[PDB]
From a paper:
The SARS-CoV-2 translates its genome into polyproteins that must be cleaved to release individual proteins essential for replication of the virus. Given that Mpro processes the majority of these sites, any intervention that stops this process, such as an inhibitor, would block viral growth. The crystal structures of inactive SARS-CoV-2 Mpro, with the catalytic Cys145 mutated to Ala, with 9 substrate and 6 product complexes were determined to sub-2.5 Å resolution.
We used 12-mer peptides, P6-P6’ (with the scissile bond between P1 and P1'), in our co-crystal structures. Six of the nine complexes were solved with the dimer in the asymmetric unit (in P21 or P212121), with both active sites in the homodimer occupied with the substrate, while the other three had a monomer in the asymmetric unit (in C21). In these cocrystal structures, both active sites were fully occupied with the noncleaved substrate in essentially the same conformation. We observed that the substrate peptide was extended along the Mpro active site with the scissile bond (P1 glutamine to P1’ residue) positioned between the catalytic dyad in all cocrystal structures. The N-terminal (or non-prime) side of the substrate had an antiparallel beta-strand conformation which was conserved in all structures, with the substrate residues and side chains well resolved. The binding mode of the C-terminal residues (prime side) was more varied, especially beyond P3’ position, and lacked full electron density. In addition to the fully conserved P1 glutamine, which is stabilized through multiple molecular interactions, the large hydrophobic residue at P2 was extended deep into the S2 binding pocket in all structures. The sidechain of the conserved P1 glutamine was also extensively coordinated in another hydrogen bonding network. The volume from P4 to P2’ is highly conserved between all of the substrate complexes, despite the variation in amino acid sequences; this high conservation reflects the specificity and likely evolutionarily-constrained regions of the enzyme. As an example, the nps8-nsp9 substrate, which is the most conserved cleavage site between coronaviral species, fits extremely well within the substrate envelope.
Numbering used by the authors:
A (entry chain A): 1 to 302
B (entry chain C): 119 to 126
C (entry chain B): 1 to 305
D (entry chain D): 118 to 127
Write the structure that this text describes.
């Protein structure tokens, strides 16, 4: 029993973390085989970070302008190229700790583990979700750029996020491992703003199923609802709309607990209306929305 | 402000 | 910025987890140097677990009665002994992935990272705290026995917990790596309840300091209190007593935010009596008590290992 | 209920 913000074990990613320095700018890089991936704004100076021309900034660099440290050993850069907002530095040594991996672009609502790093060394690991406004609520300081988000379902590391920047509200933005940003953000310090952040509704329902699985039922009620009536209520609390696809996703949890998806949707409507009245659900007084249906099944049933 | 989170 | 429930990097611990099998009972083992540590109830059968005599169950066992698998490689057991509630299995191969480590027993209220494991394979990591009643509000299923909790002190892995069992309330209990139970529990499938739990006051204050660092300041006020006046209402709300030691270890956070420790206690005092008035602190509607003062420092200053 | 020793069975 029990339910925790559970990250994946970080060892497979730790062995890939390196430091990348260009001039006086430094951040983290991801060392897989003979390629080191890092955010391209490492080729920026202190000035020229508002409207950099990365193509022009990169063509002025030689391979020896990139200093890559893997622990105590400096990697020899023998090649460099740019893919979207990510730099790909070819090195003359394949990382012997390279695990089985793949690159995956995720959709809002998806969760992943973050190994926050500074100077190529890990600071800690925590769990995150792609918010509907395409930000993440991370824990990142200066120098954390290059830290990655990942999942390790089975024996393959699925890299889904590379960290780049912090927005004025303290939320964070970055790219997939192909360098394409999540959301409309750009790797410039020009003024940008995250849209209104909404609650990941399907994740909340999954979390309520996890509570029921762990023996908690106080929040249920005898009511049901139509999908359309629920969404008309949900939108009033800045909740993401619930689609038929989400309903289907919750089928297994619905079948495991014997509570229909639309019945649990009725429960959620009452919880938003009442609050929790001094009670908690799985150790929380808010409705947790960073657990997917897949996360619940992995943690509760195995 | 918007901060690219490299270090200097 | 931002503040998350942050565990230590688990890479050095992952390379030490193995699977231990004795009959039909399977759990996890910690392979350090040439010894494997694991819960002693691995020698129990399903029918042995009500009132087992571990002294007697072990005498009938020999070295080869323990199947130790490190991945797809089977380790040869050349010795066995019992220290309190853990079993030590000497193997003929030192773990080449052995990190710098030590065994430390933690105090109630201190935090650590759990590496949940099943069949000797690491499956997840999460941060938690030794509750004042010496339970752990963990997330554990069958087969998770032998999973370990740890901290990283500078360059050294400090193993502080090994998981054994789940209480009927769904909370969990275990031992240090020397086999000594945390809390008034014993390893057998009987009715066992813990003492009444309390909130870790020093940790809540640390978490309120983390919030101020992140710009959450609505809970601050003009007031201050005293240790005696605060502890009177803290005991009334089932909060742990605040000592002069807690005030001292909070010093670095109090000076870095410009907010005296006892000024912050007045904030926490008002929060217990009047609630949060519909607001949140660091995305939480509860007073979080699973962040120590050093947890806040290492996260907000970006300490690495 | 009773304590559950969280080993696994084969």
């Amino acid at each position: 029993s029990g339910f925790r913000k559970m990250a994946f074990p970080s060892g497979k990613v730790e062995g890939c973390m390196v430091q990348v320095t260009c001039g006086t700018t430094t951040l983290n890089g991801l060392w897989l085989d003979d390629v080191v991936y890092c955010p391209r704004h490492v080729i920026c100076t202190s000035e020229d970070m508002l409207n950099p021309n990365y193509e022009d900034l990169l063509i002025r660099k030689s391979n020896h302008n990139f200093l890559v440290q893997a622990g105590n050993v400096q990697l020899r850069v023998i090649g460099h190229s740019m893919q979207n907002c990510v730099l790909k530095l070819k090195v003359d040594t394949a990382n012997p700790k390279t695990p089985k991996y793949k690159f995956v672009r995720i959709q809002p609502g998806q969760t992943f583990s973050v190994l926050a790093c500074y100077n190529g060394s890990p600071s800690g690991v925590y769990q995150c979700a792609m918010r509907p406004n395409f930000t993440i609520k991370g824990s990142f300081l200066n120098g954390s750029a290059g830290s990655v988000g990942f999942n390790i379902d089975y024996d393959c590391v699925s890299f889904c996020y590379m960290h780049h920047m912090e927005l004025p509200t303290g939320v964070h933005a970055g790219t997939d491992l192909e360098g394409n940003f999540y959301g409309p953000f750009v790797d410039r310090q020009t003024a940008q703003a995250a849209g209104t952040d909404t609650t990941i509704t399907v994740n909340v329902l999954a979390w309520l199923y996890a509570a029921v699985i762990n023996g908690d039922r106080w929040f249920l009620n005898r009511f049901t609802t139509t999908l359309n009536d629920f969404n008309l209520v949900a939108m009033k609390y800045n909740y993401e709309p619930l689609t038929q696809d989400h309903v289907d996703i919750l089928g297994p949890l619905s079948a495991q607990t014997g509570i229909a998806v639309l019945d649990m949707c009725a429960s959620l409507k009452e919880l938003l209306q009442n609050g929790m009245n001094g009670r908690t659900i799985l150790g929380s007084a808010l409705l947790e929305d960073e657990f997917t249906p897949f996360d619940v099944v992995r943690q509760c049933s195995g | 402000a918007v901060k690219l989170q490299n270090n200097e």
